[PDB]
Structures are given as structure tokens and as C-alpha cells.
């Protein structure tokens, strides 16, 4: 009972994937060539290990955040809540868009979990703590609040966020996005935020732009002293269709 | 120091699979790349994949990605790359090579090749 | 991919002679282009690598120079034994991709 998690326990073979991924971009990214991807998964590891699950900061990741830190353009970045797949599928499409996990911080922690016991210097395989059902500041948890907060920062000019219509309220103040992200938008650089939101195999052909929790999320944007636009993306398939042609 | 030995080059049916072997040797540190690339008269030499034995590591080129893949004995210093679905198009010589870089596991270019393997796609 | 254009398709010098053997990017790749050499019946011999660093054990009259999407190799006091297939690689975008090669024959 004494370190009994609720949520799952470090993926499989965490340290090999972490590594093949470092060595994979990099080859694809040749201005992120100059990262050892030994001292990565050191600085990574160092992170989160040795230290109790419930408790950790954003300096125990500060060391990674220095090894990883990158250049993309801040005007071609893209946002999204709770639309990774289609979000990632349109800057695989269109090229010179980014997410959050076409960084190198991002792609190697993408789909991972991780967390590593207090006393031993061991990773924890049999169960990881829940952001809800334990402990909000998780390994995990932790490193996607603080690589979410430097990718925020850098946004400027015209940012995309991309949203979903289907799944109820479309703005969701309690995600990572309407929490972190949306209070991390550095009104200096960044001069609007465009909403694209996506509707499910239509089902609706009302406007989902008139929804009250976009009329929020325009209000907060608004109060930050940032535009917001807000586009329907009706058909998603032709959408990707055309943006590659 | 370093050697790549191929195996012997032999006939396949079209549709059928190749499997080309590559026993390295004299290698300095277990954390190697081992890059393959055919040459074909016409398409020239292309660039197939690579691996990391020791991270069990591998990334593909888009053309060949589904047919192509490559394993690895780590024991014996020895990759594997293995082609399915042949075709007349695939009649080449596959080369395997130690990839080289600023870091050990890099494979951009290629120093120490091995003796090649012309795989002939024929019924 | 990237398309690497070497030319011209052959050349044809007498020992002693300067060949200079060219390869365009399509795109830019930085100064991540290598150099190799292809003698009948062998494997490819990388002479250069990085755009003008040669390898090991490879003499001073091969010299690679360039960078972006024009690159050159010059090999200075040219042999007999330089009778070979020389093909480029960038390896700043994946795949990497090669050159058609350039063909070099010898006067006698």
C-alpha cells in the first residue's frame, strides 16, 4: 500500500525508447545534431529518479529543459486540446507547422509514462501516480506542465489552436491547454489566436464558434490583450486533403 | 580494424523474401550503427535504413518501409535485413556499412563497407 | 527527398590534370554532403565528409569545398588509379540520397 499508484506504471523498456527516439530525430532535425542523446536520457532520468513520485518541481527538469532547448518558428506553431491525432496529422501533411511533440522534448515523451521510487534509484515499472486519483505533480505531469510553459512563451505572431467540437464543452479551462498554455501566451510576441474547431462525421452543421465556452476562451484571450479569431472545420478529411493540395 | 562480411549472393522468385546477413568484427564499443544501401542500374544507390544493435533501433526510408526490416544478433556482431515482397525492381547489390557521425550511434556516412550481395529477383 | 545532381555525366582528363566534378541539391543541405568513390567491382570509398574534411587515408589531392546547394570536388594531380565512379550524399534531410554519379576516364 505504501507506494501503490493508481495510473500505470513506466512504459516498457522507458530508457531504450527515450534514446532511439533522441537518435531518430536528431537525424531528422539537423539543427538539433549537436544533442548527446547519452546526456539527454541522463538529464531525464536524473529528473524523476531518487526522488518521491508526489513531489516533483520544475527544476528537477530544468537540466533536460537546457539540453533540449530549440529554435522553431514561433510564428508556424500549433496548438490543440484533446486532438493530438488530427493535430500532428496535419503538420505531418504540412511540414513547416509544429506541435508540441515535433520538438525534441515533446517527440521523446509523447505517449510515455514514467516515475521512479524515493529511496531506491530505480525505475517504477508496477504503477505510476494519476494526476486526479493521487498526485497532481507527477513526473509526467510535471515535465508536460514545464516544456508546455517554454513552448507557450516562445508562440508569436498568428498562433493555432485546434479544438474538438464533439467531445462536450469544446474549451476546457481545466486541461493542460486552458490552464497553462492559453496563461503562457506572451501578449508582446503573440498578436492573435485562431480556434479551428473540429466537428465530428457531421453531425452538427450548426456554428460552433457561438459556444459559450469559446465566448470564454475569447474573453480570456481578450483580457491578455490578444485577438481571436475562430474558424468551423466541417469536413476534417478534405481539410487535410487540401492543405496537402 | 573493422570488417563487414556479407553473404553470398543468390536467385529469389518474385513475391518471395531475402534475408542478407552482415557479420561485423574488430568493432571498438558495443554502441555501433549498421547503415544498408542497394545499388540498382537505373535507380542508382539508395538509402534503405539503418540500426543500433545495443537500443535495438531502426529507422526506414519511406520507399522501402513495410517490406524492409532489419534486425540484429548483438552477440555475434551480425545484422540482418530482410525484403519481402520482391519484385524485378529489387535485383541489386545490397551493401551494409558502418555509419559514422560526431557520436557513435550517428549514421550519415559511411567509411568501412561490406563485399555486397546482388540479389537477383527472377522466376 | 532530395535530389542530388552531380555533373557532368563522365569526364575525361589525362594524369596530371585537375578533374572538377560538381553536385547540386535540389534544396539546401547545410554542409552535411560527403564524398565517395566507386572503383570497379568494390564497395564505395568515402574521400570526403562534412563538405571539405577528408577521411582517413586519403590523399591531400582529393579536396571537397562547397556548401548549400553547390558543391565540388577537385582531385589535383590526377593517376591512373583514379579511374572511378564518383558519387555525392547529403545527409542533412531523411532519406539520404545520392548523386547519378560522375564517371571519371583516363587520356592515354
Known amino acids: 500500500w505504501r507506494q501503490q499508484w493508481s495510473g500505470p506504471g513506466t512504459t516498457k523498456r522507458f530508457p531504450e525508447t527515450v534514446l532511439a527516439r533522441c537518435v531518430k530525430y536528431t537525424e531528422i532535425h539537423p539543427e538539433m545534431r549537436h544533442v548527446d542523446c547519452q546526456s539527454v536520457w541522463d538529464a531525464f532520468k536524473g529528473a524523476f529518479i531518487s526522488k518521491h513520485p508526489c513531489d516533483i518541481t520544475e527544476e528537477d527538469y530544468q537540466p533536460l529543459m537546457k539540453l533540449g532547448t530549440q529554435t522553431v518558428p514561433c510564428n508556424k506553431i500549433l496548438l490543440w486540446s484533446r486532438i493530438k491525432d488530427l493535430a500532428h496529422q496535419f503538420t505531418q501533411v504540412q511540414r513547416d507547422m509544429f506541435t508540441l511533440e515535433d520538438t525534441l522534448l515533446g517527440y521523446l515523451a509523447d505517449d510515455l509514462t514514467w516515475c521512479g521510487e524515493f529511496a531506491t534509484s530505480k525505475i517504477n515499472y508496477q504503477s505510476c501516480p494519476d494526476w486526479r486519483k493521487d498526485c497532481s505533480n507527477n513526473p509526467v505531469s510535471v515535465f508536460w506542465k514545464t516544456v508546455s510553459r517554454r513552448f507557450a512563451e516562445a508562440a508569436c505572431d498568428v498562433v493555432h489552436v485546434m479544438l474538438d467540437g464533439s467531445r462536450s464543452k469544446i474549451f476546457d479551462k481545466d486541461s493542460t491547454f486552458g490552464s497553462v498554455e492559453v496563461h503562457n501566451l506572451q501578449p508582446e510576441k503573440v498578436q492573435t489566436l485562431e480556434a479551428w474547431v473540429i466537428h465530428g462525421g457531421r453531425e452538427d452543421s450548426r456554428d460552433l464558434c457561438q459556444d459559450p465556452t469559446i465566448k470564454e476562451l475569447e474573453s480570456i484571450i481578450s483580457k491578455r490583450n490578444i485577438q481571436f479569431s475562430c474558424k468551423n472545420i466541417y469536413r476534417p478529411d478534405k481539410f487535410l486533403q487540401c492543405v496537402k493540395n | 580494424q573493422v570488417q563487414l562480411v556479407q553473404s553470398g549472393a543468390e536467385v529469389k522468385k518474385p513475391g518471395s523474401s531475402v534475408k542478407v546477413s552482415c557479420k561485423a568484427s574488430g568493432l571498438p564499443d558495443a554502441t555501433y550503427a549498421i547503415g544498408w544501401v542497394r545499388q540498382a542500374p537505373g535507380q542508382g544507390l539508395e538509402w534503405m535504413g539503418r540500426?543500433?544493435?545495443?537500443?535495438?533501433?531502426?529507422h526506414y526510408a519511406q520507399k522501402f518501409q513495410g517490406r524492409v526490416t532489419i534486425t540484429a544478433d548483438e552477440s555475434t556482431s551480425t545484422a540482418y535485413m530482410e525484403l519481402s515482397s520482391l519484385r524485378s525492381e529489387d535485383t541489386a547489390v545490397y551493401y551494409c556499412?558502418?555509419?559514422?557521425?560526431?557520436?557513435?550511434?550517428?549514421?550519415?556516412?559511411?567509411?568501412?563497407w561490406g563485399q555486397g550481395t546482388l540479389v537477383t529477383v527472377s522466376s | 527527398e532530395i535530389v542530388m545532381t552531380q555533373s557532368p555525366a563522365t569526364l575525361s582528363v589525362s594524369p596530371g590534370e585537375r578533374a572538377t566534378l560538381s553536385c547540386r541539391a535540389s534544396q539546401s543541405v547545410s554542409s552535411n554532403l560527403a564524398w565517395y568513390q566507386q572503383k570497379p567491382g568494390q564497395a564505395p570509398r568515402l574521400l570526403i565528409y562534412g563538405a571539405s574534411t577528408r577521411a582517413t587515408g586519403i590523399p591531400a589531392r582529393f579536396s571537397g569545398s562547397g556548401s548549400g546547394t553547390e558543391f565540388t570536388l577537385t582531385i589535383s594531380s590526377l593517376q591512373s588509379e583514379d579511374f572511378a565512379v564518383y558519387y555525392c550524399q547529403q545527409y542533412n534531410n531523411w532519406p539520404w540520397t545520392f548523386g547519378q554519379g560522375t564517371k571519371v576516364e583516363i587520356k592515354r
Open positions: 556499412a558502418r555509419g559514422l557521425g560526431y557520436y557513435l550511434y550517428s549514421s550519415y556516412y559511411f567509411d568501412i
Open positions: 540500426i543500433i544493435p545495443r537500443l535495438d533501433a531502426e
